[PDB]
Amino acid sequence: MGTGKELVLALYDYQEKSPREVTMKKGDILTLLNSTNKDWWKVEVNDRQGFVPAAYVKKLD
């Protein structure tokens, strides 16, 4: 991004189910931190960070 990492769009609401996940609401614009895993991407949701299912977000690119 002009300054940083790529953004992704939340496609669905998702509630964190373990300590390493994070919650997102449908339509949130998240910062993508790590997409090395094909199943779980690490994102920044506002001011919180964690993994969400990769299928639930869409790269803005």
Side-chain angles (χ1 to χ4, degrees):
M1 260 307 177
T3 199
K5 305 145 201 271
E6 248 181 286
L7 297 182
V8 296
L9 169 64
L11 294 173
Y12 301 102
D13 293 343
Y14 181 78
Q15 199 179 352
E16 59 90 15
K17 288 170 184 221
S18 87
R20 301 270 177 180
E21 294 183 20
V22 67
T23 295
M24 62 189 182
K25 192 161 346 262
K26 190 182 167 165
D28 284 349
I29 303 293
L30 321 184
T31 291
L32 182 60
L33 303 176
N34 186 306
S35 59
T36 60
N37 190 270
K38 73 176 164 65
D39 291 306
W40 293 86
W41 288 353
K42 195 184 178 173
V43 293
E44 185 167 67
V45 186
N46 198 11
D47 257 288
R48 284 173 172 281
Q49 301 185 346
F51 290 90
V52 300
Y56 303 173
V57 298
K58 180 190 159 170
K59 285 177 181 182
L60 300 176
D61 61 353

XYZ file of all heavy atoms in Angstrom:
494
model
N 0.866 -1.228 0.000
C 0.000 0.000 0.000
C 0.866 1.229 0.000
O 2.025 1.089 0.398
C -1.015 -0.113 1.132
C -2.395 -0.555 0.660
S -3.040 0.444 -0.662
C -4.599 -0.235 -1.181
N 0.446 2.366 -0.536
C 1.205 3.601 -0.466
C 2.190 3.573 0.725
O 3.348 3.931 0.473
N 1.733 3.213 1.910
C 2.619 2.879 3.000
C 2.234 1.530 3.627
O 1.445 1.470 4.580
C 2.801 3.877 4.139
O 3.990 3.582 4.858
C 1.645 3.860 5.140
N 2.776 0.434 3.053
C 2.641 -0.878 3.718
C 2.208 -2.095 2.915
O 2.528 -2.229 1.724
N 1.528 -2.916 3.718
C 0.971 -4.215 3.350
C -0.338 -4.031 2.576
O -0.938 -2.984 2.463
C 0.708 -5.034 4.614
C 1.952 -5.175 5.498
C 1.627 -5.192 6.993
C 2.824 -4.816 7.870
N 3.652 -5.973 8.239
N -0.725 -5.082 1.909
C -1.928 -5.214 1.122
C -3.162 -5.189 2.048
O -3.094 -5.516 3.246
C -1.815 -6.633 0.553
C -1.601 -6.853 -0.921
C -1.555 -8.371 -1.148
O -0.548 -9.005 -0.793
O -2.565 -8.892 -1.600
N -4.309 -4.869 1.490
C -5.528 -4.856 2.262
C -6.369 -6.025 1.767
O -6.225 -6.473 0.606
C -6.286 -3.570 1.951
C -5.590 -2.297 2.341
C -6.478 -1.112 2.024
C -5.229 -2.299 3.823
N -7.266 -6.518 2.615
C -8.190 -7.537 2.233
C -9.588 -7.097 2.718
O -9.759 -6.343 3.663
C -7.911 -8.924 2.850
C -6.590 -9.458 2.375
C -7.950 -8.964 4.383
N -10.629 -7.567 2.051
C -11.982 -7.323 2.426
C -12.658 -8.517 3.152
O -12.528 -9.642 2.587
C -12.751 -7.066 1.116
C -14.301 -7.048 1.268
C -14.790 -5.921 2.141
C -14.813 -7.006 -0.162
N -13.262 -8.228 4.294
C -13.963 -9.347 4.956
C -15.254 -9.669 4.157
O -16.186 -8.838 3.989
C -14.265 -9.095 6.383
N -15.334 -10.967 3.830
C -16.504 -11.428 3.064
C -17.656 -11.894 3.908
O -18.815 -11.961 3.442
C -16.070 -12.552 2.155
C -15.100 -12.275 1.027
C -14.680 -13.570 0.358
C -15.652 -11.233 0.073
N -17.381 -12.289 5.129
C -18.311 -12.769 6.109
C -18.006 -12.298 7.497
O -16.802 -12.020 7.782
C -18.214 -14.334 6.178
C -18.514 -14.944 4.856
C -17.535 -15.409 4.008
C -19.866 -15.040 4.421
C -17.800 -15.973 2.786
C -20.128 -15.554 3.175
C -19.124 -16.026 2.381
O -19.390 -16.555 1.144
N -18.966 -12.279 8.400
C -18.614 -12.084 9.798
C -17.811 -13.374 10.214
O -18.116 -14.445 9.648
C -19.808 -11.940 10.714
C -20.643 -10.674 10.511
O -20.157 -9.672 9.870
O -21.841 -10.614 10.996
N -16.880 -13.170 11.123
C -16.152 -14.322 11.699
C -15.804 -14.020 13.130
O -15.106 -13.071 13.466
C -14.910 -14.634 10.862
C -14.172 -15.851 11.465
C -14.658 -17.110 11.238
C -13.040 -15.674 12.259
C -14.034 -18.212 11.807
C -12.417 -16.789 12.811
C -12.888 -18.041 12.545
O -12.330 -19.190 13.166
N -16.212 -14.910 14.096
C -15.891 -14.715 15.493
C -14.676 -15.601 15.871
O -14.656 -16.781 15.535
C -17.011 -15.131 16.491
C -16.803 -14.491 17.848
C -17.864 -14.806 18.884
O -18.882 -15.404 18.550
N -17.645 -14.391 20.148
N -13.694 -15.016 16.485
C -12.469 -15.769 16.877
C -12.906 -16.967 17.725
O -13.810 -16.862 18.564
C -11.515 -14.843 17.570
C -12.108 -14.195 18.816
C -11.857 -15.019 20.072
O -10.973 -15.958 20.057
O -12.530 -14.779 21.143
N -12.269 -18.091 17.454
C -12.557 -19.355 18.150
C -11.328 -19.839 18.843
O -11.462 -20.932 19.479
C -13.004 -20.409 17.155
C -14.397 -20.147 16.603
C -14.723 -21.064 15.435
C -16.070 -20.759 14.796
N -16.820 -21.971 14.445
N -10.200 -19.148 18.841
C -9.038 -19.581 19.637
C -8.156 -18.386 19.860
O -8.374 -17.361 19.214
C -8.294 -20.626 18.818
O -7.410 -19.915 17.988
N -7.230 -18.447 20.772
C -6.374 -17.341 21.152
C -5.649 -16.691 19.973
O -5.446 -15.464 20.022
C -5.326 -17.941 22.137
C -6.271 -18.900 22.818
C -7.025 -19.602 21.699
N -5.368 -17.451 18.921
C -4.564 -16.846 17.854
C -5.479 -16.283 16.772
O -4.890 -15.714 15.847
C -3.713 -17.936 17.199
C -2.786 -18.634 18.197
C -1.486 -17.896 18.240
N -0.565 -18.459 19.216
C 0.655 -17.962 19.426
N 1.021 -16.926 18.701
N 1.454 -18.508 20.337
N -6.767 -16.406 16.944
C -7.618 -15.853 15.838
C -8.090 -14.478 16.260
O -7.738 -13.929 17.300
C -8.814 -16.824 15.781
C -8.418 -18.212 15.347
C -9.554 -19.186 15.205
O -10.674 -18.688 15.077
O -9.298 -20.384 15.084
N -8.736 -13.806 15.349
C -9.299 -12.453 15.554
C -10.664 -12.419 14.899
O -10.985 -13.055 13.900
C -8.354 -11.383 14.960
C -8.301 -11.514 13.444
C -8.709 -9.952 15.366
N -11.524 -11.568 15.459
C -12.863 -11.352 14.965
C -12.968 -10.256 13.871
O -12.296 -9.231 14.053
C -13.751 -10.868 16.156
O -13.759 -12.003 17.053
C -15.189 -10.530 15.716
N -13.809 -10.486 12.931
C -14.042 -9.471 11.859
C -15.509 -9.442 11.516
O -16.238 -10.378 11.843
C -13.252 -9.734 10.570
C -13.607 -11.053 9.907
S -12.435 -11.388 8.562
C -13.179 -12.924 8.012
N -15.938 -8.273 11.028
C -17.281 -8.108 10.512
C -17.280 -8.009 9.008
O -16.387 -7.384 8.379
C -17.831 -6.789 11.081
C -19.303 -6.567 10.903
C -19.867 -5.493 11.867
C -18.924 -5.138 12.980
N -19.055 -5.748 14.322
N -18.314 -8.543 8.361
C -18.484 -8.459 6.928
C -18.349 -6.961 6.472
O -18.955 -6.165 7.192
C -19.874 -8.928 6.466
C -19.931 -9.057 4.972
C -21.300 -9.469 4.472
C -21.346 -9.256 2.957
N -22.534 -9.996 2.468
N -17.462 -6.777 5.521
C -17.239 -5.424 4.977
C -16.045 -4.675 5.544
O -15.559 -3.653 5.026
N -15.503 -5.217 6.651
C -14.290 -4.655 7.240
C -13.169 -4.782 6.186
O -12.966 -5.723 5.445
C -13.814 -5.401 8.487
C -14.596 -5.135 9.751
O -15.436 -4.196 9.795
O -14.390 -5.913 10.730
N -12.312 -3.780 6.262
C -11.100 -3.714 5.434
C -9.933 -3.951 6.381
O -9.667 -3.164 7.316
C -10.939 -2.298 4.793
C -12.194 -1.962 3.974
C -9.620 -2.240 4.030
C -12.332 -2.846 2.778
N -9.259 -5.103 6.182
C -8.226 -5.547 7.038
C -6.835 -5.405 6.408
O -6.777 -5.461 5.189
C -8.395 -7.057 7.375
C -9.813 -7.552 7.601
C -9.736 -9.038 8.010
C -10.480 -6.661 8.609
N -5.846 -5.235 7.272
C -4.477 -5.223 6.756
C -3.982 -6.687 6.720
O -3.989 -7.332 7.786
C -3.552 -4.356 7.616
O -3.997 -3.010 7.377
C -2.092 -4.384 7.173
N -3.417 -7.123 5.612
C -2.910 -8.497 5.501
C -1.481 -8.593 6.038
O -0.612 -7.851 5.513
C -3.001 -8.862 4.009
C -2.522 -10.338 3.768
C -3.406 -11.278 4.579
C -2.564 -10.644 2.273
N -1.192 -9.333 7.073
C 0.095 -9.445 7.700
C 0.903 -10.644 7.174
O 2.135 -10.554 7.089
C -0.017 -9.546 9.200
C -0.759 -8.365 9.903
C -0.857 -8.699 11.358
C -0.030 -7.071 9.578
N 0.205 -11.761 6.956
C 0.923 -12.997 6.510
C -0.032 -13.925 5.807
O -1.035 -14.341 6.386
C 1.560 -13.607 7.756
C 2.451 -14.829 7.353
O 2.005 -15.744 6.693
N 3.679 -14.731 7.795
N 0.236 -14.301 4.558
C -0.598 -15.155 3.799
C 0.220 -16.370 3.283
O -0.130 -16.908 2.275
C -1.273 -14.372 2.687
O -0.276 -13.779 1.835
N 1.227 -16.752 4.075
C 2.040 -17.914 3.687
C 1.260 -19.229 3.834
O 1.673 -20.189 3.126
C 3.363 -17.965 4.478
O 3.059 -18.066 5.880
C 4.216 -16.747 4.169
N 0.271 -19.287 4.661
C -0.554 -20.471 4.862
C -1.717 -20.376 3.899
O -2.279 -19.298 3.742
C -1.002 -20.628 6.303
C -1.653 -21.954 6.614
O -2.852 -22.010 6.464
N -0.872 -22.889 7.145
N -2.135 -21.499 3.314
C -3.206 -21.404 2.346
C -4.579 -21.441 3.020
O -5.482 -20.983 2.341
C -3.101 -22.508 1.273
C -3.485 -23.844 1.840
C -3.436 -24.862 0.669
C -3.429 -26.249 1.232
N -4.680 -26.596 1.947
N -4.676 -21.808 4.280
C -5.905 -21.931 5.012
C -6.232 -20.826 5.966
O -7.414 -20.498 6.196
C -5.931 -23.312 5.749
C -6.062 -24.389 4.685
O -6.966 -24.404 3.820
O -5.143 -25.208 4.542
N -5.204 -20.226 6.561
C -5.313 -19.226 7.598
C -4.349 -18.035 7.345
O -3.168 -18.263 7.164
C -4.967 -19.826 8.978
C -5.948 -20.844 9.452
C -5.962 -22.157 9.168
C -7.157 -20.591 10.197
N -7.058 -22.795 9.732
C -7.798 -21.843 10.361
C -7.697 -19.461 10.793
C -9.010 -21.935 11.058
C -8.891 -19.564 11.509
C -9.503 -20.809 11.627
N -4.956 -16.832 7.231
C -4.111 -15.643 6.985
C -4.116 -14.812 8.266
O -5.119 -14.659 8.938
C -4.656 -14.857 5.831
C -4.479 -15.475 4.513
C -3.747 -16.609 4.250
C -4.948 -14.962 3.251
N -3.773 -16.865 2.920
C -4.532 -15.904 2.293
C -5.686 -13.883 2.880
C -4.828 -15.735 0.951
C -6.040 -13.710 1.547
C -5.534 -14.609 0.581
N -2.970 -14.180 8.509
C -2.916 -13.312 9.680
C -3.203 -11.874 9.242
O -2.682 -11.464 8.232
C -1.516 -13.329 10.301
C -1.486 -12.748 11.679
C -0.094 -12.659 12.299
C -0.134 -12.025 13.665
N 1.197 -12.087 14.364
N -4.170 -11.272 9.902
C -4.635 -9.911 9.512
C -4.693 -8.998 10.730
O -4.699 -9.432 11.878
C -6.046 -10.037 8.896
C -6.022 -10.776 7.569
C -7.034 -10.717 9.850
N -4.778 -7.713 10.469
C -4.939 -6.671 11.477
C -6.359 -6.092 11.288
O -6.767 -5.710 10.182
C -3.903 -5.582 11.406
C -4.023 -4.555 12.576
C -2.757 -3.717 12.571
O -2.624 -2.975 11.568
O -1.892 -3.827 13.454
N -7.131 -6.185 12.357
C -8.531 -5.751 12.327
C -8.576 -4.580 13.267
O -8.518 -4.746 14.494
C -9.589 -6.778 12.738
C -11.020 -6.274 12.538
C -9.494 -8.083 11.946
N -8.651 -3.439 12.654
C -8.554 -2.192 13.371
C -7.216 -2.205 14.110
O -6.156 -2.005 13.504
C -9.707 -2.017 14.358
C -9.860 -0.555 14.787
O -9.240 0.326 14.189
N -10.648 -0.236 15.794
N -7.301 -2.479 15.395
C -6.136 -2.471 16.299
C -5.853 -3.845 16.943
O -5.051 -3.952 17.882
C -6.449 -1.593 17.532
C -5.820 -0.198 17.533
O -4.553 -0.058 17.729
O -6.564 0.844 17.361
N -6.472 -4.907 16.437
C -6.237 -6.242 16.923
C -5.645 -7.100 15.792
O -5.893 -6.742 14.648
C -7.515 -6.922 17.385
C -7.924 -6.366 18.747
C -9.285 -6.947 19.088
N -9.654 -6.611 20.466
C -9.182 -7.242 21.538
N -8.315 -8.245 21.417
N -9.574 -6.853 22.753
N -4.892 -8.120 16.193
C -4.261 -8.935 15.116
C -4.527 -10.434 15.352
O -4.644 -10.873 16.533
C -2.752 -8.764 15.058
C -2.227 -7.333 14.825
C -0.712 -7.302 14.665
O 0.013 -8.294 14.986
N -0.179 -6.199 14.092
N -4.653 -11.199 14.274
C -4.790 -12.630 14.433
C -5.096 -13.340 13.119
O -5.051 -12.630 12.122
N -5.321 -14.631 13.165
C -5.631 -15.421 12.019
C -7.147 -15.462 11.794
O -7.951 -15.558 12.759
C -5.085 -16.856 12.175
C -3.602 -16.899 12.112
C -2.805 -16.768 13.228
C -2.961 -16.964 10.863
C -1.390 -16.739 13.128
C -1.590 -16.928 10.749
C -0.799 -16.827 11.882
N -7.522 -15.493 10.523
C -8.912 -15.774 10.080
C -8.791 -16.716 8.904
O -7.698 -16.778 8.252
C -9.648 -14.491 9.626
C -9.722 -13.515 10.758
C -9.032 -13.841 8.375
N -9.801 -17.479 8.554
C -9.785 -18.361 7.418
C -9.549 -17.502 6.174
O -10.247 -16.545 5.830
C -11.162 -19.059 7.403
C -11.586 -18.950 8.855
C -11.046 -17.569 9.297
N -8.554 -17.963 5.381
C -8.238 -17.280 4.150
C -9.420 -17.184 3.185
O -9.580 -16.171 2.472
C -7.038 -17.955 3.504
N -10.291 -18.214 3.200
C -11.433 -18.176 2.256
C -12.407 -17.093 2.607
O -13.263 -16.758 1.765
C -12.106 -19.548 2.278
N -12.394 -16.502 3.782
C -13.347 -15.563 4.245
C -12.918 -14.128 3.919
O -13.683 -13.259 4.324
C -13.725 -15.704 5.704
C -14.265 -17.091 6.078
C -14.487 -17.335 7.437
C -14.517 -18.078 5.175
C -14.879 -18.601 7.877
C -14.925 -19.339 5.632
C -15.107 -19.576 6.962
O -15.513 -20.847 7.452
N -11.775 -13.944 3.314
C -11.350 -12.567 2.991
C -10.914 -12.548 1.534
O -10.528 -13.554 0.921
C -10.205 -12.037 3.866
C -10.648 -11.980 5.321
C -8.910 -12.867 3.720
N -10.916 -11.353 0.903
C -10.539 -11.213 -0.496
C -9.458 -10.142 -0.696
O -9.731 -9.030 -0.223
C -11.800 -10.799 -1.299
C -11.419 -10.637 -2.787
C -12.589 -9.994 -3.526
C -12.101 -9.360 -4.830
N -13.215 -8.931 -5.719
N -8.339 -10.541 -1.287
C -7.324 -9.517 -1.517
C -7.804 -8.362 -2.403
O -8.530 -8.546 -3.407
C -6.081 -10.142 -2.152
C -5.273 -10.941 -1.139
C -4.120 -11.570 -1.888
C -3.238 -12.410 -0.990
N -2.100 -12.950 -1.818
N -7.510 -7.139 -1.994
C -7.835 -5.958 -2.788
C -6.610 -5.671 -3.668
O -5.684 -4.959 -3.258
C -8.250 -4.819 -1.878
C -9.469 -5.135 -1.024
C -9.812 -4.002 -0.055
C -10.722 -5.381 -1.860
N -6.560 -6.222 -4.920
C -5.297 -6.037 -5.664
C -5.200 -6.003 -7.171
O -4.335 -5.205 -7.715
C -4.275 -7.111 -5.272
C -4.730 -8.531 -5.585
O -5.928 -8.738 -6.006
O -3.914 -9.517 -5.428
